[PDB]
Amino acid sequence: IEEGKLVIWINGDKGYNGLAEVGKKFEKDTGIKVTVEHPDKLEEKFPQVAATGDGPDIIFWAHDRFGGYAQSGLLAEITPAAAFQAALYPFTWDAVRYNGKLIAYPIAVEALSLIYNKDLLPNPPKTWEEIPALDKELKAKGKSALMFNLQEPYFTWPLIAADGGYAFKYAAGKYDIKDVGVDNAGAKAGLTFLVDLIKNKHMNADTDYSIAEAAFNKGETAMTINGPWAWSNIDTSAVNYGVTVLPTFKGQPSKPFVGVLSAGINAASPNKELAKEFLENYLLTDEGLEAVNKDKPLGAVALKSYEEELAKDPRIAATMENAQKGEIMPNIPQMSAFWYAVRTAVINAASGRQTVDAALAAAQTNAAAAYQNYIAKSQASEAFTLADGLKTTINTNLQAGTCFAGGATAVTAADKVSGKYGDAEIGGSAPNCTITYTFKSSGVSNKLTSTKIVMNVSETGILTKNSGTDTPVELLPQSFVASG
Ligand SMILES: OC[C@H]1O[C@H](O[C@H]2[C@H](O)[C@@H](O)[C@@H](O[C@H]3[C@H](O)[C@@H](O)[C@@H](O)O[C@@H]3CO)O[C@@H]2CO)[C@H](O)[C@@H](O)[C@@H]1O
Ligand SMILES: [Ca+2]
Ligand SMILES: [Ca+2]
Ligand SMILES: [Ca+2]
């Protein structure tokens, strides 16, 4: 991460061209170059790259992912004046509080809604149970009733939650992380209705985000389910669209998981005061938010001054009605593990490779497996922090013509350092200096116990993978792996 610059990461479905224009405004005032990028799967790339002292200065995602980042020491604690904090809604600050510490800037609140084509469907159904007979009638006319992204569990969740599915039980003050709420009759009813939609040929199991979007925007399907970010593309299509409350299931509202889009600062960033300045004085103003909101709409924004205007919009009213029927997501580190489990379960029930019952019964176990990988990935990053301090010691030792201590010493001699999960030492000879980090035999994931990571250290000082490494390749940063 280079000083005197700002790299920003934001997902490809958000108003990144609007944000790049707010960064141009910053650059003209300060002389600081801003770059907005939207790499694929950035929320999973960010941990790997920040572990090696790389990636963006600022990271945009929904708040559900930020407890995992914070827990691993990847984010800077944000500490704004109370005058600044009074400008945003208090409940949006709650979403970015982990462990007593504010860990991001809240930007906007987003919930899924039902989107419908007013020419195909002047009066959309109030219940999920009407949809099949509606699809049957529309098929006679060469149309379908409903298409949405079945590949991502965010979109199926509102239906699963409707009759009693939950993520983690809330046991006064704390979340009970071993009480997952997917293996129950209510969630089973929800997922069964969805699988029967596929089985009765009202939907296709491989429908993804872009297929559903294209079909709605070209008038092939009467309804979709999506968030505020999608409205911009429907505006420039031919469709006359409405935004409304999601349908009921078994007489109960659909319950979307509400995300608070949030902006965090990389712990390894040399440009923290500049990132703070950018977010506080440029982005989180009426001007800043209007520019992003013009590109792709944000939903209901955290800034109270600008939310005054946006709440007159009927579509924001519907978004907020849908948010009140649902729940704000947890930000605990186990959230990713939860979403990976639910993803696998939906895909397996929808394709027919398991029953609804077996698929949902396996969820808690699959989530635990996913969490174990996260723990192991997180502990393994200590290797790259200890290596970082060691490579300067290589650079100071070499003045005596050796990798090792001070003078021209033949073997490693107080060129070591201890960590929480393992110990690292300098090795090699001539100008071919290495760094080895060896994990402890216990007190650390059984995937890592007694493995080593060996690194070559070039003239310039980049760390590359030495073939002596035996720490599992899939637990290491992909960039490091790719160097060997
Ligand atoms: O399913 C695998 C996937 O799970 C996790 O992704 C979840 C996000 O963390 C969560 O915020 C939400 O993502 C949606 C955004 O909130 C919304 O703004 C917009 O971008 O749509 C997203 C849905 O595609 O839900 C997903 C689960 O669908 C995890 O973070 C990912 O790394 C993982 O790949
Ligand atoms: Ca018309
Ligand atoms: Ca994870
Ligand atoms: Ca899995």
Q: What is the 3-state secondary structure (H, E, C) of the chain?
A: CCCCEEEEECCCCCCHHHHHHHHHHHHHHHCCEEEEECCCCHHHHHHHHHHCCCCCCEEEEEHHHHHHHHHCCCECCCCCCHHHHCCECHHHHHHCEECCEECCEEEEEECCEEEEECCCCCCCCCEHHHHHHHHHHHHHCCCEEECCCCCCHHHHHHHHHHCCCEEEEEECCEEEEEEEECCCHHHHHHHHHHHHHHHCCCCCCCCCHHHHHHHHHCCCEEEEEECHHHHHHHHCCCCCEEEECCCEECCECCCCEEEEEEEEEECCCCCHHHHHHHHHHHHCCHHHHHHHHHHCCCCEECEHHHHHHHCCCHHHHHHHHHHHHCEECCCCCCHHHHHHHHHHHHHHHHHCCCCHHHHHHCHHHHHHHHHHHHHHHHHHCHHHHHHHHHHHHHHHHHHHCCCCCCCCCCCCCCCEEECCCEEEEEEEECCEEEEEEEECCCCCCCCCCCCEEEEEECCCCCEEECCCCCCCHHHCCHHHHHCC
In the block, residue with structure tokens 């029930």: 349
For residues 61 and 43, the answer to whether their CB atoms sit within 8 Å is yes
Residue nearest to atom 11 of ligand 1 (CA): 62
CA of 221 to the centre of ligand 2 (A): 16
Q: Report helix angle 185-199 to 153-162, nearest 10.
A: 120
Paired with 259 in beta bridges are: 110
110 Cβ below 6 A of ligand 1: yes
CA of 367 to the centre of ligand 4 (A): 7
Q: Which of 148, 154, 209, 301 most suits a substitution to test ligand 1, by most atoms within 8 Å of the C-beta? A: 154
Which ligand has the minimum distance to the alpha carbon of residue 48? Answer: 3
Angle CA 110–112–117, to nearest 5: 125
* Cβ-proximal residues to 105 (8 Å cutoff; 6+ apart), any chain: 78, 96, 262, 263, 264, 279, 280, 283, 284
Written as six digits, the tokens of 340 are 């990976």
Q: Which of 152, 296, 298 most suits a substitution to test ligand 1, by most atoms within 8 Å of the C-beta? A: 152
Nearest to 85 by CA among 350, 280, 307: 280
44-55 burial: b if 16+ Cβ within 10 Å, else e: ebbbbbbbbbbb
66 Cβ below 6 A of ligand 1: no
In the block, residue with structure tokens 């405004």: 25
Could you give the CA distance from residue 304 to residue 315 in angstroms, rounded to a whole number? Answer: 18
Residue nearest to atom 6 of ligand 1 (CA): 339
In the block, residue with structure tokens 């977010």: 279
Angle CA 108–89–255, to nearest 5: 60
* Cβ-proximal residues to 233 (8 Å cutoff; 6+ apart), any chain: 213, 217
258 Cβ below 6 A of ligand 1: no
CA of 116 to the centre of ligand 2 (A): 13
For residues 215 and 97, the answer to whether their CB atoms sit within 8 Å is no
Q: How was this structure determined?
A: X-ray
Residue nearest to atom 23 of ligand 1 (CA): 154
Nearest to 250 by CA among 312, 204, 185: 185
CA of 335 to the centre of ligand 1 (A): 10
CA of 343 to the centre of ligand 4 (A): 8
347 Cβ below 6 A of ligand 1: no
Question: One-letter amino acid identity for 463?
Answer: L
CA of 200 to the centre of ligand 4 (A): 27
Residue nearest to atom 24 of ligand 1 (CA): 152
CATH, residue 422: 3.30.700.10
Atom number, ligand 1, closest to the C-alpha of residue 339 = 4
Most distant CA pair in the chain, distance? 86
Residue nearest to atom 12 of ligand 1 (CA): 154
2-21 burial: b if 16+ Cβ within 10 Å, else e: eeeebbbbbbeebbbebbbb
Is residue 429 exposed (0-12), middle (13-18) or buried (19+ Cβ within 10 Å)?
Answer: exposed
Domain that holds residue 387: 374-483
Atom number, ligand 1, closest to the C-alpha of residue 43 = 32
φ, ψ at 57 (rounded to 5°)? -70, -35
Cα 53 vs. chain centroid, distance in angstroms?
Answer: 19
338-351 burial: b if 16+ Cβ within 10 Å, else e: bbbbbbbbbbbbbe
CA of 345 to the centre of ligand 4 (A): 8
CA of 413 to the centre of ligand 1 (A): 48
Atom number, ligand 1, closest to the C-alpha of residue 44 = 32
* Cβ-proximal residues to 282 (8 Å cutoff; 6+ apart), any chain: 22, 23, 25, 26, 288
339 Cβ below 6 A of ligand 1: yes
- CA Rg value for the chain: 25
Paired with 110 in beta bridges are: 259
Q: Which of 339, 342, 366 most suits a substitution to test ligand 1, by most atoms within 8 Å of the C-beta? A: 339
CA of 125 to the centre of ligand 2 (A): 19
Nearest to 283 by CA among 104, 38, 68, 112: 104
Residue nearest to atom 15 of ligand 1 (CA): 62
Is residue 265 exposed (0-12), middle (13-18) or buried (19+ Cβ within 10 Å)?
Answer: buried
296 Cβ below 6 A of ligand 1: no
Which ligand has the minimum distance to the alpha carbon of residue 118? Answer: 2
CA of 399 to the centre of ligand 3 (A): 43
CA of 341 to the centre of ligand 3 (A): 11
